[model samples]
Target: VETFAFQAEIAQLMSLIINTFYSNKEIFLRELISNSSDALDKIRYESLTDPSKLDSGKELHINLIPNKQDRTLTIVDTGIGMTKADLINNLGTIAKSGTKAFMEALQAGADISMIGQFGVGFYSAYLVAEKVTVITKHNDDEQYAWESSAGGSFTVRTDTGEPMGRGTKVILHLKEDQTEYLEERRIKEIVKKHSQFIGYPITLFVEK
Candidate 1:
């Protein structure tokens, strides 16, 4: 499903980002793509154990959904997702790590985004995203939506509508000054520069 975190954790997180790492905010794209890559890696590893269409017959890849009118950019991935427990704790405790827990859940030999680093890196979304939204689905859990905005608390809700099957979708509601990411060319350049070695295809919509 989606993701969740403590309100105070979010408080410390926002302060940390503002205190540092706010200079090169473009890296948020790379950070997110890296997280997606790690997620896709988990699914790939699981497929080898049972081989029952872990990917649900869908191609493995990442998609970028940029809506200029709404001032939001969405990152979608097709990969193994997290359960409610995973969302709350893993995504919640960024100051430290869910390493012990994540390592156990990963069952060893499987690669993860290191929820510790990914957690801190995730808060980087707030650099450009005035509001952040994550909708995720795991093979073993129902879909859930996690959201927070304006440097405050967050909510986790059950999703009853259509689900993306697996993996996470992170939506960044861009701050007014950060809308340049809406440009396909600019976004492509960042992806090309930061993720030339990525294993999966990243699709960016070109409406012009």
Candidate 2:
């Protein structure tokens, strides 16, 4: 396991989001779905130039799995997944200019759930989750797990699970107070409201 610290500006960013995005936390789902769609778009574009980028022509889609027993919700996508370097560089820091927008919003007291609007879309996961784990396998890279608790640091561990083909999987360990996201109906409503136009199919694994 390799641990990395959050960017310097992340502390302020996380603090502001925790304070402001409380009620509209479900927007995190939209952010996640949107991200997956982008990933799918990337793979499609890349495959046009190089055929093997398709990961054996796996179906491209988004899958949501909620496990009540584990109190976790996962968003999986068959798309262009992240390499280890991509995971570290993408999740490890925000762009230098992005934090100013966050800082400005904080100072202006903007009551908007806008973290996803910035480049920090992935960080929105922390709004409703105590911890987030991203397991991804890119065509050019081996699978890896990036785990963090929205704290100062995150860990990157070599994954030993079943092959994920080529894509990304985000598992959110919901906070005790955020159990509403654990329900299929509640999340479906959010997806219907925000991700209705997504190009890829959004599937929520339902349990009776």
Q: After superposition, how far is residue 30 of candidate 2 from its true place, in Å?
A: 0.5
* Model 1: CA > 4 A from native: 1-10, 19-21, 53-55, 94-119, 150-152
CA-only RMSD, every prediction: 6.8, 1.8
- Report the number of the highest-lDDT candidate: 2
Error of 2 at 85 (Å): 1.2
Ten residues in a row with the worst lDDT in model 1?
109-118
Cα error, candidate 2, residue 193 (Å): 0.6
TM for every model, in the order presented, reads: 0.81, 0.92
Give the per-residue lDDT of model 2 (tens digit) for 16-71. 66666357788889889988999999998888898877754558999999988899
